[PDB]
Amino acid sequence: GKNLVYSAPTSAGKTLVAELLILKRVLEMRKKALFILPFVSVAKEKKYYLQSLFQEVGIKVDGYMGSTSPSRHFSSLDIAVCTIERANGLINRLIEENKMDLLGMVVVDELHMLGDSHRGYLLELLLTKICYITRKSASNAVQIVGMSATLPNLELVASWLNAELYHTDFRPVPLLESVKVDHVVSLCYETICDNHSVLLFCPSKKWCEKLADIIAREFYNLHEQKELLEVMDQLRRLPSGLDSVLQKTVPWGVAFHHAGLTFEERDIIEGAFRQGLIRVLAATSTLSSGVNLPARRVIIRTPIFGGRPLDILTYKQMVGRAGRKGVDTVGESILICKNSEKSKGIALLQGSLKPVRSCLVTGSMIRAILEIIVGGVASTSQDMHTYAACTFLAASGAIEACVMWLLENEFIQSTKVYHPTHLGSATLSSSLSPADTLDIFADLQRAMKGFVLENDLHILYLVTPMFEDWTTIDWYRFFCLWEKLPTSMKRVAELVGVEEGFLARCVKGKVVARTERQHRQMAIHKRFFTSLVLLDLISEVPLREINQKYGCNRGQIQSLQQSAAVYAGMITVFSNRLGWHNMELLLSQFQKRLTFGIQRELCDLVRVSLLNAQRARVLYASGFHTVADLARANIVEVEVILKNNMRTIWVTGRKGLTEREAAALIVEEARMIL
Amino acid sequence: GKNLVYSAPTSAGKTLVAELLILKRVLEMRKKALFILPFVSVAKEKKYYLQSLFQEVGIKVDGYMGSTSPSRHFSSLDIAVCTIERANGLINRLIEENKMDLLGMVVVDELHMLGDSHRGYLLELLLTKICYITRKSASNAVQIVGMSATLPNLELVASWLNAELYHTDFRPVPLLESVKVDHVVSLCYETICDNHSVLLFCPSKKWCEKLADIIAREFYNLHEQKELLEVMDQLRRLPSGLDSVLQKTVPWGVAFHHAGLTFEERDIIEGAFRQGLIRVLAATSTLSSGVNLPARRVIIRTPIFGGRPLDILTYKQMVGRAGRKGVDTVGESILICKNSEKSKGIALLQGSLKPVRSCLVTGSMIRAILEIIVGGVASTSQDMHTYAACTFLAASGAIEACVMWLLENEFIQSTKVYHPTHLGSATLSSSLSPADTLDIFADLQRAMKGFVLENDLHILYLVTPMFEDWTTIDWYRFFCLWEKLPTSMKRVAELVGVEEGFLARCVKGKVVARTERQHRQMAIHKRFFTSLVLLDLISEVPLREINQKYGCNRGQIQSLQQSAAVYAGMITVFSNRLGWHNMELLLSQFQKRLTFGIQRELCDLVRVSLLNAQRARVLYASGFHTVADLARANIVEVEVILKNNMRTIWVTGRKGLTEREAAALIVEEARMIL
Ligand SMILES: COc1cnc(C(F)F)cc1-c1cc(C#CC2(O)CCOCC2)ccc1C(=O)Nc1nnc(C#CC2CC2)s1
Numbered sequence A, B: 001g002k003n004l005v006y007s008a009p010t011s012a013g014k015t016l017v018a019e020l021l022i023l024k025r026v027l028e029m030r031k032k033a034l035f036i037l038p039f040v041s042v043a044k045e046k047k048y049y050l051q052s053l054f055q056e057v058g059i060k061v062d063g064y065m066g067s068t069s070p071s072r073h074f075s076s077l078d079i080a081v082c083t084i085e086r087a088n089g090l091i092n093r094l095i096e097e098n099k100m101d102l103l104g105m106v107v108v109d110e111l112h113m114l115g116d117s118h119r120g121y122l123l124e125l126l127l128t129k130i131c132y133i134t135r136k137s138a139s140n141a142v143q144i145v146g147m148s149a150t151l152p153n154l155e156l157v158a159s160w161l162n163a164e165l166y167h168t169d170f171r172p173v174p175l176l177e178s179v180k181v182d183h184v185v186s187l188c189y190e191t192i193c194d195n196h197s198v199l200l201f202c203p204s205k206k207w208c209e210k211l212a213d214i215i216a217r218e219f220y221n222l223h224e225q226k227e228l229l230e231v232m233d234q235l236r237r238l239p240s241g242l243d244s245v246l247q248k249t250v251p252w253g254v255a256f257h258h259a260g261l262t263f264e265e266r267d268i269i270e271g272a273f274r275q276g277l278i279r280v281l282a283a284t285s286t287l288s289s290g291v292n293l294p295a296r297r298v299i300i301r302t303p304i305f306g307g308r309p310l311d312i313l314t315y316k317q318m319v320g321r322a323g324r325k326g327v328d329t330v331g332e333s334i335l336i337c338k339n340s341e342k343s344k345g346i347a348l349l350q351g352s353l354k355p356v357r358s359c360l361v362t363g364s365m366i367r368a369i370l371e372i373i374v375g376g377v378a379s380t381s382q383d384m385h386t387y388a389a390c391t392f393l394a395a396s397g398a399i400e401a402c403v404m405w406l407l408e409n410e411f412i413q414s415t416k417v418y419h420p421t422h423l424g425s426a427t428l429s430s431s432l433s434p435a436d437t438l439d440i441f442a443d444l445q446r447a448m449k450g451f452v453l454e455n456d457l458h459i460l461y462l463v464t465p466m467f468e469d470w471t472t473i474d475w476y477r478f479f480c481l482w483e484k485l486p487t488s489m490k491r492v493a494e495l496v497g498v499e500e501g502f503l504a505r506c507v508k509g510k511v512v513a514r515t516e517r518q519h520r521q522m523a524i525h526k527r528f529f530t531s532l533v534l535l536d537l538i539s540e541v542p543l544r545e546i547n548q549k550y551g552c553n554r555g556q557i558q559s560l561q562q563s564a565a566v567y568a569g570m571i572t573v574f575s576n577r578l579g580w581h582n583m584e585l586l587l588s589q590f591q592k593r594l595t596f597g598i599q600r601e602l603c604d605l606v607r608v609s610l611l612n613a614q615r616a617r618v619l620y621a622s623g624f625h626t627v628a629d630l631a632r633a634n635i636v637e638v639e640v641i642l643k644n645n646m647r648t649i650w651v652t653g654r655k656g657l658t659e660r661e662a663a664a665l666i667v668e669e670a671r672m673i674l
């Protein structure tokens, strides 16, 4: 229980050590384990893997990722496979409730993210709080396990965490590198003739689509069918339908995988590839940091990705997916270069990843100071410097500046001793960034004076996140929709701040330059467009209909859905902690409605993990209006309802599931819910 | 008519050459002649002097200064004694109306203000426009005469204006500067016994008052009466009454003069000092650049003014007031010093004033570009660079940045010819700075959607200027007034943006730190406090009642009065040019009501220059409700009304006026108006 930080090339079973450590710790100390994964997809994959592995030892495994959360109290859980942001929230809530002693270990995967990143600082703060609380109260308190690629300063991280060090560059499939100067037809032909699949990464999404189409054309012209047809049918029965280009590419074992698709389509392509059924997949940069998806031959189209040299970490994690342990002898990754790109290619071939930074006036420091002060762990400035000493920045004078920033904005109160008033406690328990909480407070307080209850648009405007640019807003379409809007929605539009003059400016004049800080007025109209999209989402309209009506593809629609669900949950917690009972009551339902994009009727019927938003409606239309009603039904009835030995329906973390047994698991899990 | 730029010490008849030049030009060419003065008080004094000097030659003199404007069309005028800002506005209007050829000369006094100052850049833009128009369209077009103290780069100014150069250090009363460091009573006794006046310059208002108090006390302990009693009675019957400290200081030949007093009290004190009735006058830095008030001996309290060494220009214009031409032989300017202040004093005794800068992304450059483009004198970048060359900055590449700034904010439209749209023409005509015109547009547009006509407060909030901090707001009193406000005024308070939360924050907690640009919300509450003060002003409540109710002294109240009058006129012109007829109609009355602080009924009755706000009320309450009704009245009637050979009433630019002939002039001017 002396902590641990180790690194090893992926595909070497590096998570094996972590799984055994979780087993030993949870079985001996009977304490909790937090498994922190960087992204939601890998988080779900790991959650299902842990569930499958450990279901036989009477141990629960349920994770806090995305907009979801375990259906059971955290007390019953034994392993929590959460994400970085939600793991930080978990740590903050545990500190607030004075139950840190319940925690037995915090396993962290992909520790290299702790450096330069928009979410690495959350990991740094989480680990810093663990170290601080462990040092203040005492050698079996809380173990930390870390995983990553070859880190130049891995020993520095181990010293920071007071953990052992273990780094070995061993992989069952050695990776060979000998540059030999598109000329891809013969290469792909000789790769396929060897009975091997191909994974090729492209810089753009349209470029990936086009390359998949071209490769399908090559294979169709020049040169199992049952499983391919099964995958085709699986793709067909989806809310968003089947892509035309995907339609003409899939039958030839060639397809594409980009952020434009929906999560279900991406899952279908990934699962098809893992079986070898897809012989060519044109992916993008996102898949590099996605689920474990090995391929004998990996292809990288160009060192230039998005108008800049491809990152060394991205290249390393792309090449790490070259070779299969147990069936391959040697994998291969090829980076096609050019005369001008030869220098970039040779530069990327050599050199390890850059050193890990700290990313700590800065919003991260204000966040950390708030966390410690309102967590009741660093109240007096005497001990608050020990926390700064515990940070990775120290291990590798802004505290006074940030502390003042919190008192100026009434986040904390001074008495020598600092305390939170109500926005410090509402900000920390809400897991909202203190910088944006001022705007959130101002907007919510304004809404409660003049709220519009005719429709859900005013509630949607308050749970609409604009922390990132999900899509390039089309302003002519937006103006047309504004013209077509009813009066009920226009009332809320005027209330929030949307002006017809600004839309008139944008429809014809170029995007107004937001040079001045006071031009958050641009963010208001983007937020209103997003809120209209969200209203269409929760009105249960098809993804394609929204895509044509607003210009946002289905992938961006789903990403906005997840962001709005998480933001609605966060705002609900904020309002609950601020004592805004009517606001909390209005916002409580919306988290699930955004999560699933369903109407108020289906909220109870989506508590079954096996019931989608489309499957909730067909079961709801048939006459099942509640989980209890589902619990009382024959398998054959739901089977025929769904139909109106070969696998068609798709669900996350699935198995050899067919329509026959799919209905059986709906009632079985419905019974368990009761 | 070859322009001219000359410098000479004040108190040497340095304006005689200028008066001669205006006389000759106006009589020969029969063309107008502006006379730009820096401040409103000196502008009024010069206007009255020119009126007296040229009334016998059929030359009409009436200036555009402060919140006032001539009652007759500019066409009838022969000399316009305007201020820097209003002279710039006059030239802009002349350019807009394509009647620039009416101008025969532009005499500029105190040209040293061209350098470091918040109003010098207006002078630079004015002179640059004169030069550009003269050169683009030609020997005797528009003469420019200049004046200043000893200027290190006077020849540079002459070269910029392409004018002559004359610099002379000659004064009839050669000044004898002498710094020296018990005997104070003896020095005061020997100075006063010489039958000469003394002018002290103290840094603080309170210290000036207290020093005058101690000097009066010492004169009393060590101890014409009729004329001093006349001055005392003149001070007595003023709207602000008589100051107790001034009451006990005046009758000993001692008095004080600061911005705290009212314009009428300052005028009375200055007149009494000029006649010799006041022997000792403790003034402040403001009087240094004010009216021509010579003194035999000037004394400077300490070079430390406002926590910093006294300015060199300020010190020079202080010593310039030492010596009377015609009755005195020599002048003395003593600067008492201490051990620590000896170095600063010695530094101030030696050395001339610093060179004149230009003060030209900068708002001044945006203003200049807007003026030229909207005026139709530089529509293409080819010639606009010529205007840049004409500037004093050139004579001693930001245009592209400024032109984009105007296109970004829709001040001008590109076609490559440039034009104004509506806000470019409305911004130039109103003489509003383009930086603040965006906020003004946003606020006025928002008001027209939800205007409150119950009271005059919502109109006042839109004509309240917050370009400077006229007073330090006492937030406890403001909160008390807030909780005591009616509902009609609270409606407008909530409409504009005033929140009880911010007022509560300020009432107990320290003044909130406005570290962020989004915190113009502090300016809203200061503006509302100022608008309440203005509402009490135009409601015709006494100055003392406002001072007790709000904490702002009478001098600050009058300064805010003038600022609000000018801003109301500017906003009225802005609304007129933008085509806002109802807003212009509502704002049209308020300029005069704010100029005089009267009610709607007295607005017509104050058209007589010889009628204060108090003199309009006593005549109105009697039954004279119109200027025409005044024209039909006997002198004895108005005299008895005023009562209910002694010069007891004060009026600007007065003469041996008592209540007997004061009534006579009221009816005489009433007839002239008709
Ligand atoms: C109150 O906070 C949430 C509420 N609800 C949801 C859910 F509904 F989605 C998610 C959150 C959340 C969102 C982000 C985030 C984020 C972004 O990256 C993306 C969205 O926009 C802002 C930035 C980070 C942390 C949290 C969070 O606190 N998680 C937890 N939940 N239970 C917990 C417990 C417990 C007791 C056992 C001890 S800890």
Ligand SMILES: COc1cnc(C(F)F)cc1-c1cc(C#CC2(O)CCOCC2)ccc1C(=O)Nc1nnc(C#CC2CC2)s1
Binding pocket: B064, B066, B067, B068, B069, B074, B085, B086, B087, B088, B089, B090, B091, B093, B094, B429, B430, B431, B465, B467, B563, B565, B566, B567, B569, B570, B573, B591
């Ligand atoms: C439209 O502008 C005004 C309207 N009305 C008043 C009056 F009612 F007060 C004053 C102004 C004004 C204010 C400032 C100013 C200023 C500050 O320093 C102080 C206040 O806040 C902003 C900064 C500067 C210029 C002007 C102005 O244009 N003057 C003129 N009037 N007729 C003119 C003519 C003509 C035809 C013969 C050719 S030119």
